[PDB]
Amino acid sequence: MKYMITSKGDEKSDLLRLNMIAGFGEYDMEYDDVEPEIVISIGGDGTFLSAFHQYEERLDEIAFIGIHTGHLGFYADWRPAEADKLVKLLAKGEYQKSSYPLLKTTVKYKEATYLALNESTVKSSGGPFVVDVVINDIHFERFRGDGLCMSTPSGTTAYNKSLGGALMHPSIEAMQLTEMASINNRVYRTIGSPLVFPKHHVVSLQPVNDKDFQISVDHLSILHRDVQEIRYEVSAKKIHFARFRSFPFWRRVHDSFIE
Amino acid sequence: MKYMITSKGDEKSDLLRLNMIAGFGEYDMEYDDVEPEIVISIGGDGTFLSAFHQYEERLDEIAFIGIHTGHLGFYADWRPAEADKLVKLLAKGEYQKSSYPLLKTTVKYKEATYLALNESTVKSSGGPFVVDVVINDIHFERFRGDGLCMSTPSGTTAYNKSLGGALMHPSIEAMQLTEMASINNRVYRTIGSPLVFPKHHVVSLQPVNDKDFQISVDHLSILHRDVQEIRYEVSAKKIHFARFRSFPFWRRVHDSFIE
Amino acid sequence: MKYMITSKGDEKSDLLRLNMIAGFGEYDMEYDDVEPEIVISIGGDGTFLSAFHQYEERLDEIAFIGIHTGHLGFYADWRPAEADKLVKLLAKGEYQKSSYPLLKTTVKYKEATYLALNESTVKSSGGPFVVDVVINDIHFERFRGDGLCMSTPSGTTAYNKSLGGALMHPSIEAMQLTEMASINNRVYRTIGSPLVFPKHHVVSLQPVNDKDFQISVDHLSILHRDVQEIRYEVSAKKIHFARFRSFPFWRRVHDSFIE
Amino acid sequence: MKYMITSKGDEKSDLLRLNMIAGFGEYDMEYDDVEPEIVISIGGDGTFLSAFHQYEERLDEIAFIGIHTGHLGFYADWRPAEADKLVKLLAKGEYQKSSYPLLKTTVKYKEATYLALNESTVKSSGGPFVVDVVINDIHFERFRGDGLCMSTPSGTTAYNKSLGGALMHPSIEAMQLTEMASINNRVYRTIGSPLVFPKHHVVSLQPVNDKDFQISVDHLSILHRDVQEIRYEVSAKKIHFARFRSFPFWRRVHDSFIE
Ligand SMILES: NC(=O)c1ccc[n+]([C@@H]2O[C@H](COP(=O)([O-])OP(=O)(O)OC[C@H]3O[C@@H](n4cnc5c(N)ncnc54)[C@H](OP(=O)(O)O)[C@@H]3O)[C@@H](O)[C@H]2O)c1
Ligand SMILES: NC(=O)c1ccc[n+]([C@@H]2O[C@H](COP(=O)([O-])OP(=O)(O)OC[C@H]3O[C@@H](n4cnc5c(N)ncnc54)[C@H](OP(=O)(O)O)[C@@H]3O)[C@@H](O)[C@H]2O)c1
Ligand SMILES: NC(=O)c1ccc[n+]([C@@H]2O[C@H](COP(=O)([O-])OP(=O)(O)OC[C@H]3O[C@@H](n4cnc5c(N)ncnc54)[C@H](OP(=O)(O)O)[C@@H]3O)[C@@H](O)[C@H]2O)c1
Ligand SMILES: NC(=O)c1ccc[n+]([C@@H]2O[C@H](COP(=O)([O-])OP(=O)(O)OC[C@H]3O[C@@H](n4cnc5c(N)ncnc54)[C@H](OP(=O)(O)O)[C@@H]3O)[C@@H](O)[C@H]2O)c1
């Protein structure tokens, strides 16, 4: 089948990449980075995040696999020493697919949409951050603070976790909203707690005074000017992984945070 | 249809109860507190929790309704001044049913099972609290601290919230595990974060030294001796509510915590 | 004595300012905004913070007073309706002085020093934030995350509080370091907890890769390039307040956050 | 000088104890566990806490030293392999004394007072926990939740830390109040944040309905019945340590929590 390999770009990763291409040379596997069916990422979770965004127009046609050159990754499921075993399994087609939910972000000004695998965040462009938070058209809170983070399930181990969010098993189709440094006093009030939203709920952020926001989607971060609305919902699209063995989410969590 | 009414037992609640019984007297509604089809709770969420546990052997046959005499409740959806309107709607059958997930607790010694609408918690019987946390038979962490709290979705606004858990929309079939005062240092390590579990995941707590635990299920709290295992999973059973109008979960959250 | 009055600049504040100047006209009080001995701030705590930084070269010669036009302030101790009573008390000299500790920030490149009344914070200029935290020349932790906040005692009710810091009575000569969204996992480790430092302890932040930082001192926020060190210590300088009645810190905290 | 040695009571600790007694036999050092001037604890910080409470009537006459048999301790400053070096230094009198602040607890019914080296905590005897918190005779908050923890500076690394309190350098004469699982909503309000109190401030807890409380002082935990008041203040008494080398507090914190 058609495949391609992205590399973190250090010496370790490029050579492991060349090795796998040579190894794939011995099977009915065609290198194709335009219309690949398998996308192998070699590096860290940052490398995997870039591979996902490189091909996010064909998530329906692609199964992703990650090899972590440094520490273990939540998306890069494989060690370098296992590359040859992976080459053989992929060529023989002995793999199941699994899917993770994704987050849709819409920015209205006159409208851009993004897909996130980890999260989308909103901060001010320097001044104070104040937004109205509207859940399914109902005004829920006026948020004052440093910013807001909306995480997918697999994103819950990343920025969301540092903000006090829960870790959510990726079989749950949800998104999680966490606060960054909310102001709470006599007059200003936020919920405080993380909020977990099911599919089809729409969280809308609406400016109060300033209309300029620094918006991040995974690694990408852009200053958006004259914003009327930021809309969050669980995407209809999903990322697909090639899975060759059992590696449960909670085992990845244990291995990454406990030992 | 058959119905019964429990009362918080103060003067306000009993009289509102008597009024509704008189009001039901004018329809084809039979008072029956053995095999009721509708269970009306008048009081607070504590009163509603007691009504649920009174009839938890027939959750399949019952739709619950709550009237809050004091502050607004998350389960008691109705104000006293609306009692007469409620009498009329219930008698005419103009109601939809909605369901919330419940938590199953199994205590093995030689085995008791409980159903919780808010949460189940585990603490020691005085000494230090140490348990091994096993997720789907995989050892996840050795927890040291004051205790652990496993919450249903509708429970996430209660004890779970005070422990830093996320609020979860009740359409999500999940349970959430939060830490009470975990010890984390060079040698002792817990995840820290709340954990959200889908249906069919089994969280097992296993003693390390002491085998005596104070276990709570909603309001009930019992000292269990010589415990071998505490098992948590999302129940196959659900609570059913009679719904007569739109009152979204996030609106209940806003009304209860924001204003 | 010599005095001056700064105003938030809205209609309410300017007119209250003009009234007090007219009122001071009836005593031996000379308006002087170059070498004032009393500095009256009329507005909010933001207005007071600007008054403090306007005159921070003569904190030894000045007693500050604040009038809050909007909500109650932690530094603006007086309501508008009390302005005339304040005019009379100040002119008669019936006031005690009280002092709050201040934070000294040194940025080395080739060295700038700042004084903060609330706090100094450090964030990256966009990329990831990584710094080594050195306490009294001893390497304490490698911090990864969004940033760090060093608060005075009276600052503990502001940004520090939103970050989970403790509130500290201003009679304690200390500074408090809080984390913004620290990354903690198998490999990366921060203390997590706020840290409270006595006088004469020196906390030094040292770059790891990137040398560009966005540094804030109270309201001021500046991009510093090619930074070698950020040094925090409790200042030898203190702010002095004119006090005319009992208004305990914990009462200000109660009034501002509880009711 | 007069000295005594307490032991954790395992084989390692008793034998290390016997060795030091034999070693002390070669100097002008008299074993005396009634009126000792030096108290050596061999075990963990729990062993040291028991030694402190054994002799808390003569804290003015005693310098404490701790040897940790297991992991490093915050009070047990010495490893077993260094016992002989310690014997020699103590006998030669080559030691400085350092002092840590202590917490005074008064329980009024008709009045008991306790001294804590780590902290004092208050919980209910089973039902809900509700107390009024009075700071220097001013009503500050009505606390609802699981309990409250008042920590000394050296206690801030223990229970206080697990509750989200700040770590405080022990040269600061203060106590820190942290919340256990506070309920915060539309009607119920607590400060949330830890509170740091200077010397001479008096925090008083006063019952609201129930008068029975489980009160802990370091390891001791007792059910107090018919309580009228719990009073917290920084003690006039201090613990004195024999110090033979530099081991800064922040280095102990680094070694215990970072690596
Ligand atoms: N305060 C924070 O915790 C914080 C702040 C900003 C951004 N981030 C994370 O950074 C991501 C994008 O940046 P980047 O990765 O391109 O560069 P980066 O900022 O250097 O990456 C931050 C770290 O997050 C790790 N990571 C990525 N996805 C993760 C996941 N799902 N669970 C746990 N850890 C994960 C990455 O692992 P590798 O080393 O294997 O790449 C990397 O070490 C965002 O999606 C966000 O989640 C975290
Ligand atoms: N630290 C804590 O936050 C804490 C500690 C222990 C127990 N609890 C809660 O108490 C419950 C059982 O006690 P109880 O109600 O019989 O007596 P209780 O301890 O007096 O009740 C505690 C309060 O929780 C409220 N509550 C109940 N269910 C709730 C929900 N789903 N979301 C938000 N608030 C809710 C009750 O409202 P009403 O006043 O209307 O009854 C009551 O005010 C447990 O299920 C637990 O969630 C909370
Ligand atoms: N996430 C946060 O909580 C956050 C983030 C950034 C900055 N800030 C605060 O903003 C300050 C400087 O900004 P600014 O005041 O010029 O404009 P600002 O960002 O609009 O001010 C933020 C708010 O903090 C209040 N405040 C100031 N000093 C305080 C104190 N000691 N305790 C409690 N609240 C206090 C101000 O009261 P007034 O309305 O009376 O002016 C204002 O409402 C910083 O010193 C920092 O503490 C807070
Ligand atoms: N949730 C919690 O974190 C929690 C709950 C209850 C009690 N405690 C602590 O337990 C103490 C009394 O119990 P115990 O020690 O007799 O038995 P314990 O409950 O078994 O001791 C708990 C642990 O705390 C450690 N510790 C003691 N003082 C400390 C300090 N100042 N800083 C950091 N760690 C410290 C002890 O070290 P060693 O192993 O060397 O003895 C022990 O490992 C209390 O003073 C309280 O601070 C903690």
The amino acid sitting at A104 is K
Classify strands B63-68 and A195-198 as parallel, antiparallel or unpaired.
Answer: unpaired
C45 is annotated as an active-site residue: yes
Q: Tell how strand B203-207 and strand B129-135 pair up.
A: antiparallel
Residue set of the binding site of C for NAD(+) = 45-46, 118-119, 144, 146, 154, 157-162, 219
Q: Provide CB contacts within 8 A for B81, sequence distance 6+.
A: none
Alpha helices (runs of H) in chain C, residue ranges in sequence order: 11-24, 45-54, 83-92, 159-162, 249-253
Ligand with an atom nearest the CA of residue B116:
2
> Which residues share a beta bridge with D59?
none
CA–CA dist C204, C64 (Å, integer): 31
Determine the distance from the C-alpha atom of residue B200 to the mean position of all C-alpha atoms in its chain, rounded to a whole number: 19
Q: Which amino acid is at B3?
A: Y
User: Ligand 3 site: residues with CB under 6 angstroms?
Assistant: A 128, 145-146, 181, 183; C 44-46, 49, 73-74, 118-119, 154-155, 157-159, 162, 218-219
The DSSP H or E segment spanning C115 is strand C111-116
Question: For chain A, how many residues are written?
Answer: 259
Token pair listed for D256: 């215990």
- B190 labeled part of a ligand binding site: no
- Chain-chain contact of A138 with B251 (C-beta, under 8 angstroms): yes
Q: List helix spans (H) across chain B.
A: 11-24, 45-54, 83-92, 159-162, 249-253
Q: Please give the resolution of this entry in Å, rounded to 1 decimal.
A: 2.0
CA contacts within 13 A on the Cβ side of A232: 30
Domain spanning B102-236: CATH 3.30.230.70: no
Neighbouring CB atoms inside 10 A of C13's CB total 23
**C-alpha closest to that of A169 among A155, A181, A150:** A155
Distance D141 CA to ligand 4 centre (A): 28
Which uninterrupted H or E stretch holds D24?
Answer: helix D11-24
Rounded CA separation C206/C108 (Å): 10
Q: From start to end of chain A, where are the E strands?
A: 2-7, 30-31, 38-43, 63-68, 96-108, 111-116, 119-124, 129-135, 138-145, 147-151, 167-168, 174-180, 195-198, 203-207, 213-217, 220-224, 229-243
Query: What does chain C come to in residues?
Result: 259
Q: Which amino acid is at C26?
A: E
Q: Decide: C64 and C237 in contact? Cβ < 8 Å.
A: no
Parallel, antiparallel or unpaired: strands D2-7 and D30-31: parallel
Residues 6+ away with beta carbon under 8 Å from A6: A39, A40, A41, A42, A43, A47, A50, A51, A54
Contact C184 A257 (CB under 8 A): yes
C117 Cα nearest atom in ligand 3: 45
Residue A165 to residue A196: CA distance in whole angstroms: 9
Which ligand has an atom closest to residue D117 CA?
Answer: 4
Beta strands at C119-124 and C147-151: parallel, antiparallel or unpaired: antiparallel
Report yes or no: A255 and A108 within 8 Å, Cβ to Cβ.
no
Residue C220 CA to residue C215 CA, distance in Å, equals: 8
| C186 contacts in chain A (CB < 8 Å) | 71-72, 255-259
Query: From CA D96, how far away is CA B105, in angstroms rounded?
Result: 57
Q: How was this structure determined?
A: X-ray
Distance between CA D7 and CA C4 in Å, rounded? 67
Residue A227's Cα: distance from chain center in Å? 23
What SS3 class is residue A208? coil
Beta bridge partners of A148: A122, A179
Shortest CB distance from C181 goes to which of A180, A184, A256? A180
Which of B68, B162, B214 should be substituted to probe chain D, the one whose Cβ sees the most D Cβ atoms within 10 Å? Answer: B162
Q: Which of residues 158-187 of B touch D (CB under 8 A)?
A: 159, 162-163, 180-187
Nearest CA to ligand 1 atom 29: A158
- Domain map (residue ranges) of chain A: 1-101+237-259, 102-236
